[PDB]
Design a protein around this ligand. Structure first.
Ligand SMILES: OCc1cnc(N2CCOCC2)s1
Ligand SMILES: [Cl-]
Ligand SMILES: [Cl-]
Lengths: 301, 301
């Protein structure tokens, strides 16, 4: 039946994307009810970016300093404030395409869909995990800033990410929709590096369950193991520790397949020590860690 | 930077998806203007699966046998005709969400986005390529039939795929939106199997050019090759023959990076001989063949 990195359908979010301009800087905003959300760094000249005083730069600004474009319509900005690293532009018009939504903050290891934008114009959608080091491995060029991450639960869009910057290594850093950074990052032109990342162990196991469900069974074995024995291997390979809670979340997949988590940890232990003996799993030569147990259950059942 | 299997924003396709029911069979239809397109096999029962006489099964149907449903709204069917393997249900309402669109037949190697859908509700979006053996490696469960593949260039949706069936090896077969199958396949449950699959050589080369644009150079070598020597090597690894057409298509990525097409071909021959020696290219430990030369520029420069 097959297994693919799958994004949520993006239409409910496409209806919310606008172009925000302040001086020379144009980038993407999120228009929900009568507010446009975008990165506060939209107000900064290149010179400001080196050591910005947002407080001071913003009082110096007025409503008319902000051009908001929803397709071929100018919105009138009637107010401006800041919450953490996010700029809120109050507009005269409630977005008639506002979906059922909430602002949510996600945990490392959780996945979400990204609508990549360019002049308030949506261009692509991809799935990605919040890394243990609080970065994401996006695909962004200039103009992507204010591109947004989301999940959909029934009809409700849960917004969890707004893109702020690229780090030197090609990875991306951003905020929740309340403007709190994911990770130890600041919105200033300064020296910042991604911390050393780790592998999301519970997601690798979920993806091994997806492989078995799809008839990729070769890596299975008669053996089992313990959390403690496994976690001494994981810690060795820069794998996150597996907790009792991770084992409980993989419950449904363990039932559906007949392979218990420490059963499957034994398989993963051997893959870490011995490698893949030149094979693939679901058409990958890497151990994939950007599918959650929920993602595997949603896609396979 | 970053390099991601990115799907087109799905919103313009989401507003076209409906549920078609006939007898005890429910699947997806595509509602454009006053027509719903779906697989003709919606009109089959149990003993119509091996040798359906579609002309005989359809003449016995009236408009009211077809229950079409857009969210909660029932659409009234006022007409029906068959075009190749696609059924066309005429309805009394034109879809107010109809985007600018066209129907295109794609060739092997081309990529598109798939909007996977169940009971006319979109569930996810992913990027595919038409394999050289005219199948797609999708993610499709029971009820996905009538899910569509598409590109979006400058606000115009080009429909290129409609999902009909899963073959014994877990890969997928379907039609263009004129009802003609890709490959030698038929909408009958008689034994059928895909041709042996090959790697899309032109796409792999485009992806090596993207790796060089994004700063990877470790796999380059001082060698060149003749086109003919390259094909004699590449076919021993089940790679598609590279043609002069393919060489012309890579010209711009050649010019951008200053590496001739037959120099990059020498690099590919070396990678097939050596593998990757614990390294990765753009985040993969395999040579990726689902990015086209056109996609590589859409996502790079
Ligand atoms: O219940 C019997 C079936 C199971 N899976 C099916 N699908 C898989 C691929 O998409 C079309 C057919 S029919
Ligand atoms: Cl400050
Ligand atoms: Cl094509």
């Amino acid at each position: 039946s097959g297994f693919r990195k799958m994004a949520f359908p993006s239409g409910k979010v496409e209806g919310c994307m606008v172009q925000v301009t302040c001086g020379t800087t144009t980038l993407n905003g999120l228009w929900l009810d009568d507010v446009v959300y975008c990165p506060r760094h939209v107000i900064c000249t290149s010179e400001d970016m080196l050591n910005p005083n947002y407080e001071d730069l913003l009082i110096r600004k007025s409503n008319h300093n902000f051009l908001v474009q929803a397709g071929n319509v100018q919105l009138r900005v009637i107010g401006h404030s800041m919450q953490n690293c996010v700029l809120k532009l109050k507009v005269d018009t409630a977005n008639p395409k506002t979906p059922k939504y909430k602002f949510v903050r996600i945990q490392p290891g959780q996945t979400f869909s990204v609508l990549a934008c360019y002049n308030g114009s949506p261009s692509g959608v991809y799935q990605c995990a919040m890394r243990p080091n609080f970065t994401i491995k996006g695909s962004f060029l200039n103009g992507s800033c204010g591109s947004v991450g989301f999940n959909i639960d029934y009809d409700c869009v849960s917004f969890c990410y707004m893109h702020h910057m690229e780090l030197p290594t090609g990875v991306h850093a951003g905020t929740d929709l309340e403007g709190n950074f994911y990770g130890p990052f600041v919105d200033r032109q300064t020296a910042q590096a991604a911390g050393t990342d780790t592998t999301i162990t519970v997601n690798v196991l979920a993806w091994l369950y997806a492989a078995v469900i799809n008839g990729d069974r070769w890596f299975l074995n008669r053996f089992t193991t313990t959390l403690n024995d496994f976690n001494l291997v994981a810690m060795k390979y820069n794998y996150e520790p597996l907790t009792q809670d991770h084992v409980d979340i993989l419950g449904p997949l363990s039932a559906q397949t007949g392979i218990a988590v420490l059963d499957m940890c034994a398989s993963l232990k051997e893959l870490l020590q011995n490698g893949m003996n030149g094979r693939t799993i679901l058409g990958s030569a890497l151990l994939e860690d950007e599918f959650t147990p929920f993602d595997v259950v949603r896609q396979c059942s």
